[PDB]
Design a protein around this nucleic acid. Sequence first.
RNA 1: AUGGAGAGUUUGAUCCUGGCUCAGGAUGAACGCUGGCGGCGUGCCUAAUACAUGCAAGUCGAGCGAACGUUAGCGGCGGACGGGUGAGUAACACGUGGAUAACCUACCUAUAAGACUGGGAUAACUUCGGGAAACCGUAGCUAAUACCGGAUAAUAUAGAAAGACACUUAUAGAUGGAUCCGCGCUGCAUUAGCUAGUUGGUAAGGUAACGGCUUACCAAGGCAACGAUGCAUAGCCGACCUGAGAGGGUGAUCGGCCACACUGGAACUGAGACACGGUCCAGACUCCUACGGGAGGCAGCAGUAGGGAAUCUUCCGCAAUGGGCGAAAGCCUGACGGAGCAACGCCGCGUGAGUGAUGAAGGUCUUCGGAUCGUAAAACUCUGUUAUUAGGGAGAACAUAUGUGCACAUCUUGACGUACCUAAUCAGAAAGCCACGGCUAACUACGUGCCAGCAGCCGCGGUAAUACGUAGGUGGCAAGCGUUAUCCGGAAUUAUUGGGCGUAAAGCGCGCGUAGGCGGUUUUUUAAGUCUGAUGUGAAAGCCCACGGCUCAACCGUGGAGGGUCAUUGGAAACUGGA
Lengths: 77, 68, 83, 198
Amino acid sequence: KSAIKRVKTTEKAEARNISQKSAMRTAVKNAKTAVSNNADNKNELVSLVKLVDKAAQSNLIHSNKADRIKSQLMTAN
Amino acid sequence: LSNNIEINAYIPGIGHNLQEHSVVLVRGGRVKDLPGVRYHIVRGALDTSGVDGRRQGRSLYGTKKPKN
Amino acid sequence: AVKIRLTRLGSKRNPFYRIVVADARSPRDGRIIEQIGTYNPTSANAPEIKVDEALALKWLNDGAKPTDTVHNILSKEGIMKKF
Amino acid sequence: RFRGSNWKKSRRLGISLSGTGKELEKRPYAPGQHGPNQRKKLSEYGLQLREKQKLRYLYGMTERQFRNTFDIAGKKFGVHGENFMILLASRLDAVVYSLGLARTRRQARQLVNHGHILVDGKRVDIPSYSVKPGQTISVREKSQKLNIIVESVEINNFVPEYLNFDADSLTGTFVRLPERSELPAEINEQLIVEYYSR
RNA sequence: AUGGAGAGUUUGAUCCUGGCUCAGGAUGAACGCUGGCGGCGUGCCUAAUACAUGCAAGUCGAGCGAACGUUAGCGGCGGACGGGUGAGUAACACGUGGAUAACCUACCUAUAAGACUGGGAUAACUUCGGGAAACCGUAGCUAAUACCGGAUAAUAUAGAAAGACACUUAUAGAUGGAUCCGCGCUGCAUUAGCUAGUUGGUAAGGUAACGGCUUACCAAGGCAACGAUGCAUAGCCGACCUGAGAGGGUGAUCGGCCACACUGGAACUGAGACACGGUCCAGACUCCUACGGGAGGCAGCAGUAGGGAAUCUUCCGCAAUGGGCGAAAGCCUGACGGAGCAACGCCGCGUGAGUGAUGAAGGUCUUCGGAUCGUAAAACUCUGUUAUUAGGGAGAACAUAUGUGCACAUCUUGACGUACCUAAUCAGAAAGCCACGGCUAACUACGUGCCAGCAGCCGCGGUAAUACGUAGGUGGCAAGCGUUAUCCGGAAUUAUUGGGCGUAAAGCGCGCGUAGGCGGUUUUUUAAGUCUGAUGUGAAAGCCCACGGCUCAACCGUGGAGGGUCAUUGGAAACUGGA
């Protein structure tokens, strides 16, 4: 009766539109592109702030994967 | 019997079943020094129970009609 | 949601419940995070409330309450009046 | 519990101890079939089984019903050999065989209603009563004076040890500790102390 | 050492090895039945037997649009969890440890956190052509603590939507999995062998991890006896019998885990699957039929059909114990509880004699000799323990004005409601079946007379079978009794305590040769070694030294005692086969 999304939702969270997941994948496609082109998107590492007004304000990515890119960023400055 | 098996069975006692082509329980026991038959046949068991002649058994050999 | 669930284990029709820091998603035999000895409600011996929640003091700060509605069972374990 | 003749207990067994004269009008020879022939010699396991059958007619509880009796005469700590004569006198027949109600054990088991039963409080209509230091196996208020309870009140003068009995009372509440050698000695002790163990 | 252990079988009796025909308990049982009353439990054991069903579990505004605390239905939220049967991994899969420089650690609630910053908008409402249902069309929309990244903290040294008189980065409180080795695993003689990046090398990545995963390349008869490699196939364990111990067994329970979900196969945004009733794809099935369709849990419950010598009702309730929904309240439950169920073991209150005429009216064997089925007995008294209506009432224990830091107040219960018992003291019945010459505690008359019976061992039947069948019986035991398949007494019987190196149970004719199984070498060694050492721990459906009562039954606390610990050398060398 109650839609499950806290227990075994491995395939329950993998059964709808992936447009937003694909759109977020295109935004994280410049991970090495901006680093190889020296973009200003990864500039000013005092913020990325990216822990005082980013994660909660507006964020929609992965966990461990993002954490890897959330280590060098938000701390470099 | 069942499972496509054929054995030289024999009805021990005086019981003379008169119902052919009918299932008959195989008495759990073999014969004693009898070249040919190597198995027994249980009296009654969805067939001719037997005769009421004997009354000293009242346990096996299709016994029934307890005298009072 | 993580209170002191009474682990119902032992023989049939006579489970020996043992108050332990368990979750609400794992009822009866689930997962104990902070075991608290065991409660004996046999009412035929002296040692009854033999709960050892010495390491359960950290549990009472972010997720700790009653699982099997045991107010008098937790009444003996008076570890409050200090906050 | 045996529902049979109580005169074959001194013929099939070798230790009856239930009546004075029994072979006076009978034939004290051997068994039944070969009663006019010679006797035999009890076997090692046979002697321990003969005593069990001898006590089977004596004790009210038979095989499985006397679980406690055999359990109290085996695992119980103490003289294991004489544990069959020590931890086995806690029945309700002992009170009737010490106060003067029933001379037999089978009649003593049926004397837990017609004779004294109210053991200072809760009574028991079984073959064994919980008579300990504080229990007074007496009669009831309506059954104070019975016919089988006050039968041999003067016929049975000599009483046994660890037992009490008076006129218009018959209430046993003396010593709780009994003797392990105050019973007939015809069966082996270590034999039943080992066979039972198995 | 609570301290096993019969025979026959072979002359006409025999000893002696040897094997079981056979002096017993057990029998998840059924059984032909003579199965008075019952506390408690198991019950398609024969059956992963096919399929009509009753059927998984509903909800929520402190945060939003009916007519009238949530009433509009969106959003938080178990379909995989309760469950069901166990064909399925001869093996970390489970049983069983430290662990992790093989390690992830999503997660669950408290505080930082200032409700910040880009927002339109969303189901309902509903403009709504038709369609037997088998689906497109006509389409505007309106919300909600539904909801949107960069510059100012976290491996640097490149913060929000809002709570009453909710909250977010950091993280804690908490939390689920992958892993090393030490442990459970059949033999083939009528098979005697198997891996080749077998054996180790480092580099394209990415997941619980190194990575022979692929990465460049790498050997010959090498691997393997550790039968790897073939099979055997089974859900694994906590367990109960057992020799007296020495030996030996080692799972029905009841819970953990490991599975499965017509059959397979490939993928699918929100928080940990292949999903017991979401997808798609195919296959052979299910059935009605508007020509199109629906598809199947009954692997959730109870049933129709299956053949079972061998097994539960298509019955009430959520008392309660639950958890999931859900400011409370509300609200969910063939999870679970209560009644039908059979000798399934019930063993006892257990059913009448205080008294008592040869106790017969004459029969049980009767050469009648007496006794007696017979201190059976009359007919009463006796024995209470049958009704007669009865009103009856521990796993799991604290609460609900708004007056109260793991403490708690006006105000929170029933699906019930007849143990032992000395009491009313009506009269409600322990019978039975078996051997009876026996072996083995047991019989008299007739009737039989190799006709039939009896018939484990004996055998009894061609005449005087009390062995047969009826009557009077007798030994046994216990509300009953004979039967069928399953361990151990029997007895060591691949010998292990429990085998010879000759008749027994035993001469390889193989005379010439290392299977490393094993066959004096003096002294001599540096410490293979016998008895001391980290001891915390010392737990346990474990024999707990006691521990609680249910009379006959399931009523359970003691981790130090308590063994079933978890000090037995680092060590004292003139010494199995090898000097």
